[PDB]
Amino acid sequence: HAPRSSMMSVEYDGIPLIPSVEEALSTLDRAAAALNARRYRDALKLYLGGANVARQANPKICNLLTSKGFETLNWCARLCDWIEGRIKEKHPRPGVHKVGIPVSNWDEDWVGPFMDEEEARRMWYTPVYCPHPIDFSNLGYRLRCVETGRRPRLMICITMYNEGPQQLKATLKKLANNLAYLKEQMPGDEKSLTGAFAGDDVWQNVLVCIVADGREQVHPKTLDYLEAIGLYDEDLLTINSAGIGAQCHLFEHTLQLSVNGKCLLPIQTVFALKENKASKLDSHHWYFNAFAEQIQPEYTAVMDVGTMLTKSALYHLLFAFERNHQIGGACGQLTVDNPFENLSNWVISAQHFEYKISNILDKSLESCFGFISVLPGAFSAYRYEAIRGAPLDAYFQTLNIELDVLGPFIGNMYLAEDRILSFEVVARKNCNWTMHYVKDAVARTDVPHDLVGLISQRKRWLNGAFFATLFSIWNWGRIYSESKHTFVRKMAFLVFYVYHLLYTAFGFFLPANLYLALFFIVFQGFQQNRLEFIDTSEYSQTVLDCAVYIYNFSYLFGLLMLIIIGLGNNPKHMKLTYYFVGAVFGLMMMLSSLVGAGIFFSTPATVHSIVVSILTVGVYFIASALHGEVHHIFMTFTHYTALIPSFVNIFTIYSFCNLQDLSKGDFKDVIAKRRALEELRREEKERVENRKKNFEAFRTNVLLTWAFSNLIFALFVVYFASSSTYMPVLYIFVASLNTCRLLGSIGHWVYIHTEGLRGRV
Amino acid sequence: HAPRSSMMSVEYDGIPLTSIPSVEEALSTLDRAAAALNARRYRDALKLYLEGGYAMANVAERQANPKICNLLTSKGETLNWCARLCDWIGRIKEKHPRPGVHKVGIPVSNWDEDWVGPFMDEEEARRMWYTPVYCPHPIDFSNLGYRLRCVETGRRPRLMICITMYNEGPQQLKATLKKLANNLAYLKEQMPGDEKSLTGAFAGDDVWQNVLVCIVADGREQVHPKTLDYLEAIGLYDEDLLTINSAGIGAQCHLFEHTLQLSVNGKCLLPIQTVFALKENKASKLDSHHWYFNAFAEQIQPEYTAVMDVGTMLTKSALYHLLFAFERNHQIGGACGQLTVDNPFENLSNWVISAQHFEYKISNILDKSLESCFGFISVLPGAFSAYRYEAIRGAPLDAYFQTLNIELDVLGPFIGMYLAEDRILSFEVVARKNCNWTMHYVKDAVARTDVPHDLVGLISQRKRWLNGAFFATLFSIWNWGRIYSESKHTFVRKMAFLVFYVYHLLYTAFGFFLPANLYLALFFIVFQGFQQNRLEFIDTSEYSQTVLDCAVYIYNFSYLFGLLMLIIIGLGNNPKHMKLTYYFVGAVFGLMMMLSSLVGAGIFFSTPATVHSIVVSILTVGVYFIASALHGEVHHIFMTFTHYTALIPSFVNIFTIYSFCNLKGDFKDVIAKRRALEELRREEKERVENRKKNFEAFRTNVLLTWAFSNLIFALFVVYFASSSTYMPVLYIFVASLNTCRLLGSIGHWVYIHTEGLRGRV
Ligand SMILES: O=c1ccn([C@@H]2O[C@H](COP(=O)(O)OP(=O)(O)O)[C@@H](O)[C@H]2O)c(=O)[nH]1
Ligand SMILES: O=c1ccn([C@@H]2O[C@H](COP(=O)(O)OP(=O)(O)O)[C@@H](O)[C@H]2O)c(=O)[nH]1
Ligand SMILES: [Mn+2]
Ligand SMILES: [Mn+2]
């Protein structure tokens, strides 16, 4: 008991015994929050932040703070009058005030046609509150183009989010090259453009709109570059956006760019940096709704950040748009930059081959029928007459209506919604807008050089592609039900719909078909003595079954590991495992390719065999030679064929794995407010949990359907079909698909090379 | 051009019209002052605290409620703290100033006029004591001046009970408190002056003073509103008092103290010395135990410390049996009570509840008896376990809370082991340096809890349980050398621990390959008795020869498809929206079990029942009934054998798969502060991403190891072993394990029934 008494006696003995600018910014931020919550008395009090500090020795900061204080005091007077009621107005907000500060860097040595000092030397900036970008023009926001009276006929969007300065600099240099090429067209000839895109004035009619995604995620080097080109200012942003509470901040500057001894054409640029992170869909929402509804361009082009365009990409797009007068939208060719260089990388070469083949075959076939599912990230352009209303409304339905009402089906559909916009353009009511694919308007992008980055990219691509394909398949009746196309166009669309259904059905069972083809040809030619270049009649009879058993077990274990990994961890720490699986599949397909080549060469090459082989495999080379670019295929065929199983299995599995990856009161009044806030928090948590439950349930159901359909098809073919009664069917199906694609490419080539001469009729 | 001019003229015409305090205000200002003081900005903290104090002083007069008026006047304490902080800013030197602690007791709203008690004073009976606590690291809870009513009144508790509660209905808490009062009444009613009853601090008429029941909540945002209403009813929570007195303190949790009086029908329950520590921010049960153990135990310094979850009803003699064990043994470093499902006889139609009851009874009897024979128990999660605060004081608790003290990044994914760290506390108590503490299992101290009645709830619970059990088992296996390396046990104890370590290694190795062993056993016995004519009660010699292989093929395909679906679903979506799928798989496995069960019974009854067969069958299966009859409770097993047998494969496969599958500055200073905050946020995001990457990578690696080890073992047994060369081995292994468990149960029974008579020697 002595330790207890000692401790308690110890406790008993231990028992006895000028304002600031940051303050102004915080108070204005609180006032903005109070005004957001509609507490006008407190908002007026805290706003009256509004003059004593502007002690600053820096002339620019002193002027900015003086102007901000004066504007805030004027706004306080306006709000006080509003509360007094002598001025009646709906939803009061601080007045729109854009501040033009002299740019930090201006080049004394620069060459331009003609320009004014106010536009050239000074940079304009305005923070905007617009919650719904439709009433951007209603709240009084204007752009320098509108203020100066320039009426841009074409606008371009460059969505940018966490990129280095090099990509943006390359994109802007390429755009300047495009503008220079548009300037240098010879007048008074048949081929060149005429009208608003002539020389010496083309730079005024094109506006390049850079939409960021989040002030918290853009690269500091990116911001340093933007300040260097004279389009960003942290001090100006912080001073002039203190109490406005802007959702996005837009800076306007017709920036001048110089490269070596050649000074690029000035580019009319608007850069909308948005405060809260959102999706590329939200960036397009801001861009399209606000800026398009304001200046109303004739053509609207969209490209990602890092896509380098040739000198004639914009020229070819505009030429197509003017000469056709029917195209409701078009997209340029997507190409990997420097394909010849760095040929040692297999992933880069495989991506190059995939892009070239996809473009040529699929895009030519789809452009023949006037409906093209644009590749994600491709440099696509539309005309703002086929997109004005219902197409854009459908495009942004996901943002306008919360994901709970739509469901998971619509959300996964709108993951890559550029295809949805394309379909809505094609099937717009009471209008016949077809689509087009421009071969010569090549837009060079920079694809990932690692298998893990390729895996993530192809996951998002395949998710969007699959569900947009489902949308088109289910809603294809709208083309005949609502649109007014020609009867020939309706029949062509019906034929393409039949082809699309067959192609999508084949691609759904692609893993099962690939497994069956490899198994049958290679391993049941080896086991059952069907490889014409070798006699395995007797052998040991242990290796004969050992080959099939090893192949089956390796394939099944690889598929199980792939499913587990794709369902689980992010494919960035599994680089070694994914490289191992990809290398195993690649080596297996090189073995299969040599086995198939041996079989084809040892076969006495009957007429049916040679026709099928041509029409199945050599269709790639035939279409490439027709289009004039065959060296790319010649170089990248082996690299891509080494990556066919990785592509099919890994990418399809991972894409299907993550379908759910989607973005003066008293004390009684105080207690009631606390209870209401707690209840709203609980309801929001429950609603988010229900959203996640529905999304994950749909993901798992669709994944189970896909995987078990493939497994059941493979088992029923293996157990109930021989190589002689299935492989002819597979060859017929693949030959039919490649025949349709070859006919499409032939039609696209003949259309391009013939429509010029037959333009009179 | 006409509509363009029309719209631009419309915009031009639209161009006209470029260059008395409040209590809520007082609470908000005090909260801001608390935040500023947390940020160590003493000038701003002093200003805001002064404003809040004066605001409360002015507001309190206008309140009509006498309680709120007096309480707000008293709180407007804040002015005294303001004076202290102003003096601190140097005539008073003090390190880390904070508002002085102040506990305020308001009369309880409801006091029972008709109530019977031994003797009590009005101050403790009618008044409820409350104090908010800042203490961040609960070790210096006593250093900051915080005291409990037991310490203030001089009552010196010797047993302290913890009831962790989080999002629970009033009924569970009321049942737990009623059962605790029943235990206190039973401790009162012990006959003095006899051999059996306890002597000393737990005698009659005063035992209620020596026991403190500490209720620790987990979050004020998650506790049930009905739970809070019940707490007000028993007079232990006051929302107004909390909201006012916790304004500027910024307490991490709020503790209320009340010797609550409970009445049930015409019988008045014993008063319970209760402390209710409600945590402001949500945390884990580990953090709840951190607060409980460190703060309260280090303060009052108990003799025994008991831990129970909420909803666990104890019989009248649970505490008596635990304290009898602790007093009479004088060596037990910790004990755990029996875990039992309430009302097992009732609702026998539910299969999941019955299976859980059978699992609890068999696990308790067999495993806990065997472990208590050897003095080392892996405590079941949620069980009513108790320790003595002499074997837990230092290193065991430090190891227990290592996860909280050191962030999971340094520890790794293996250590994050501490999901269920009660086993870790058990092992650290057993292997504490320089002292020999063993554990014990109290059969008669039954703690009845309430299990989930749905397969999905069972799945989640068993995921938690299996996760903790597996990694605590790995810890014990890897660190079992510490018992001989550091502890001072008897040589016989060291040898017993070595024998138990060998048994534990074998048992864990067998349980790791449990799915593969179950699949092989079912496959071999049932389907390779049916296909190969080994079922002694039927002759399948000729048959159709198509159904003979069809049975094996159907079983294999169904098992593999079910396993794949289970992996995908478990590892993917949350098992709450897949109730139908999980019930389907469970029903399939239960029907398969039924088939296997009757097939095995037929095989045994048709076999001529040789001596080896009967011995193996008895010792393998009837070991359950033998141990149950020895312990006197055999009716439970007799009624629940079939119910648990139907759920063996669901248990093993589903639960194991889910558990393993989810492992005064200027603007330059302001800009520098913004940049520092951005960089800190980015580094925190990167650190969280790295944590998740390592965590998921370890999860997937262990899952792949487990699944592929099971698959490879199953394939190598199927292809390279016959039923005659593997099933004898499986029978021998399981027979050995059940022999060890039966011997353990027999030893525990004989120890309990013999140690009393042989206590002299
Ligand atoms: O959350 C995001 C991620 C990306 N982006 C942008 O939207 C386009 C997405 O293409 P990305 O470059 O991510 O795909 P890639 O070209 O790398 O395959 C690019 O302009 C991105 O900067 C966006 O707006 N929000
Ligand atoms: O985040 C949590 C979840 C639970 N608990 C409590 O800690 C114990 C965890 O046991 P649980 O109820 O999860 O297990 P069960 O009884 O449901 O099988 C119970 O007292 C819970 O109320 C907690 O402190 N924090
Ligand atoms: Mn890109
Ligand atoms: Mn519970």
Tab-separated table of C-alpha atoms in Angstrom, chain B residues 450-564:
chain	number	residue	atom	x	y	z
B	450	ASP	CA	-25.171	-10.765	-30.426
B	451	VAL	CA	-23.853	-12.030	-33.775
B	452	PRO	CA	-25.064	-10.868	-37.208
B	453	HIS	CA	-27.940	-12.928	-38.572
B	454	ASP	CA	-27.088	-12.360	-42.253
B	455	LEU	CA	-24.432	-13.992	-44.393
B	456	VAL	CA	-23.119	-10.588	-45.511
B	457	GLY	CA	-22.656	-9.344	-41.951
B	458	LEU	CA	-21.007	-12.645	-41.083
B	459	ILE	CA	-18.718	-12.184	-44.093
B	460	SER	CA	-17.593	-8.724	-42.977
B	461	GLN	CA	-17.131	-9.772	-39.347
B	462	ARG	CA	-15.172	-12.880	-40.299
B	463	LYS	CA	-13.029	-10.861	-42.695
B	464	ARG	CA	-11.976	-8.673	-39.769
B	465	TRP	CA	-11.502	-11.687	-37.490
B	466	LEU	CA	-9.490	-13.758	-39.966
B	467	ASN	CA	-7.298	-10.802	-40.945
B	468	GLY	CA	-6.325	-10.176	-37.344
B	469	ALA	CA	-5.961	-13.867	-36.524
B	470	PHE	CA	-3.704	-14.612	-39.500
B	471	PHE	CA	-1.280	-11.768	-38.973
B	472	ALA	CA	-1.179	-12.163	-35.189
B	473	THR	CA	-0.440	-15.841	-35.840
B	474	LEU	CA	2.448	-14.879	-38.114
B	475	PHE	CA	3.728	-12.532	-35.399
B	476	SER	CA	3.566	-15.259	-32.761
B	477	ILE	CA	5.289	-17.757	-35.060
B	478	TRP	CA	8.108	-15.374	-35.966
B	479	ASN	CA	8.659	-13.943	-32.469
B	480	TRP	CA	8.076	-17.107	-30.427
B	481	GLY	CA	11.805	-17.131	-29.689
B	482	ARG	CA	11.345	-14.140	-27.387
B	483	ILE	CA	9.778	-16.362	-24.708
B	484	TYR	CA	13.079	-18.186	-24.191
B	485	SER	CA	15.256	-15.213	-25.155
B	486	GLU	CA	13.885	-12.640	-22.693
B	487	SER	CA	11.248	-13.975	-20.288
B	488	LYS	CA	12.029	-15.884	-17.082
B	489	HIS	CA	9.696	-18.874	-17.234
B	490	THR	CA	10.139	-22.214	-15.532
B	491	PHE	CA	11.942	-24.864	-17.568
B	492	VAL	CA	8.756	-26.943	-17.715
B	493	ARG	CA	6.951	-23.835	-18.979
B	494	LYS	CA	9.578	-23.336	-21.686
B	495	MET	CA	9.215	-26.957	-22.796
B	496	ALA	CA	5.416	-26.688	-22.820
B	497	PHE	CA	5.703	-23.511	-24.887
B	498	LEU	CA	8.026	-25.254	-27.350
B	499	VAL	CA	5.575	-28.147	-27.732
B	500	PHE	CA	2.729	-25.688	-28.247
B	501	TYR	CA	4.821	-23.790	-30.796
B	502	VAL	CA	5.350	-26.978	-32.797
B	503	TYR	CA	1.615	-27.674	-32.641
B	504	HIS	CA	0.778	-24.082	-33.589
B	505	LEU	CA	3.131	-24.188	-36.572
B	506	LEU	CA	1.561	-27.428	-37.805
B	507	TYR	CA	-1.982	-26.141	-37.244
B	508	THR	CA	-1.310	-22.849	-39.032
B	509	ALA	CA	0.338	-24.662	-41.942
B	510	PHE	CA	-2.703	-26.929	-42.239
B	511	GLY	CA	-5.135	-24.019	-42.016
B	512	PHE	CA	-3.250	-22.137	-44.719
B	513	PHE	CA	-3.956	-24.963	-47.203
B	514	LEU	CA	-7.494	-25.417	-45.853
B	515	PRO	CA	-9.333	-24.587	-49.124
B	516	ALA	CA	-7.120	-26.940	-51.129
B	517	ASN	CA	-7.472	-29.697	-48.529
B	518	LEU	CA	-11.260	-29.301	-48.427
B	519	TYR	CA	-11.508	-29.416	-52.216
B	520	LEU	CA	-9.272	-32.485	-52.385
B	521	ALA	CA	-11.178	-34.274	-49.617
B	522	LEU	CA	-14.582	-33.645	-51.189
B	523	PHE	CA	-13.341	-34.466	-54.696
B	524	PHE	CA	-11.584	-37.692	-53.712
B	525	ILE	CA	-14.129	-39.132	-51.277
B	526	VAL	CA	-17.406	-38.230	-52.950
B	527	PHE	CA	-16.694	-37.964	-56.644
B	528	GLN	CA	-13.856	-40.479	-56.984
B	529	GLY	CA	-15.919	-42.913	-54.981
B	530	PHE	CA	-18.844	-42.339	-57.311
B	531	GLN	CA	-16.830	-42.346	-60.544
B	532	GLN	CA	-14.421	-45.158	-59.629
B	533	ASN	CA	-16.975	-47.276	-57.705
B	534	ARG	CA	-15.740	-46.825	-54.149
B	535	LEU	CA	-19.032	-45.979	-52.435
B	536	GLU	CA	-19.561	-49.242	-50.564
B	537	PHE	CA	-23.365	-48.839	-50.559
B	538	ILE	CA	-23.793	-48.708	-54.357
B	539	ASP	CA	-22.366	-50.505	-57.397
B	540	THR	CA	-21.451	-48.090	-60.198
B	541	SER	CA	-19.300	-50.657	-62.008
B	542	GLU	CA	-20.785	-50.292	-65.507
B	543	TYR	CA	-23.350	-47.450	-65.429
B	544	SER	CA	-23.624	-45.243	-68.515
B	545	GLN	CA	-19.889	-44.305	-68.322
B	546	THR	CA	-21.048	-40.809	-69.377
B	547	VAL	CA	-22.387	-39.750	-65.956
B	548	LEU	CA	-19.382	-41.313	-64.229
B	549	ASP	CA	-17.113	-38.652	-65.723
B	550	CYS	CA	-19.968	-36.131	-65.746
B	551	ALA	CA	-20.116	-36.064	-61.943
B	552	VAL	CA	-16.422	-35.200	-61.614
B	553	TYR	CA	-16.578	-32.703	-64.483
B	554	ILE	CA	-19.632	-30.947	-63.025
B	555	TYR	CA	-18.101	-30.785	-59.551
B	556	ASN	CA	-14.788	-29.443	-60.850
B	557	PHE	CA	-16.393	-26.843	-63.117
B	558	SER	CA	-18.854	-25.671	-60.458
B	559	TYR	CA	-16.122	-25.406	-57.822
B	560	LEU	CA	-13.768	-23.508	-60.130
B	561	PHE	CA	-16.463	-21.121	-61.374
B	562	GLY	CA	-17.623	-20.465	-57.819
B	563	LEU	CA	-14.061	-19.828	-56.668
B	564	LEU	CA	-13.408	-17.387	-59.521
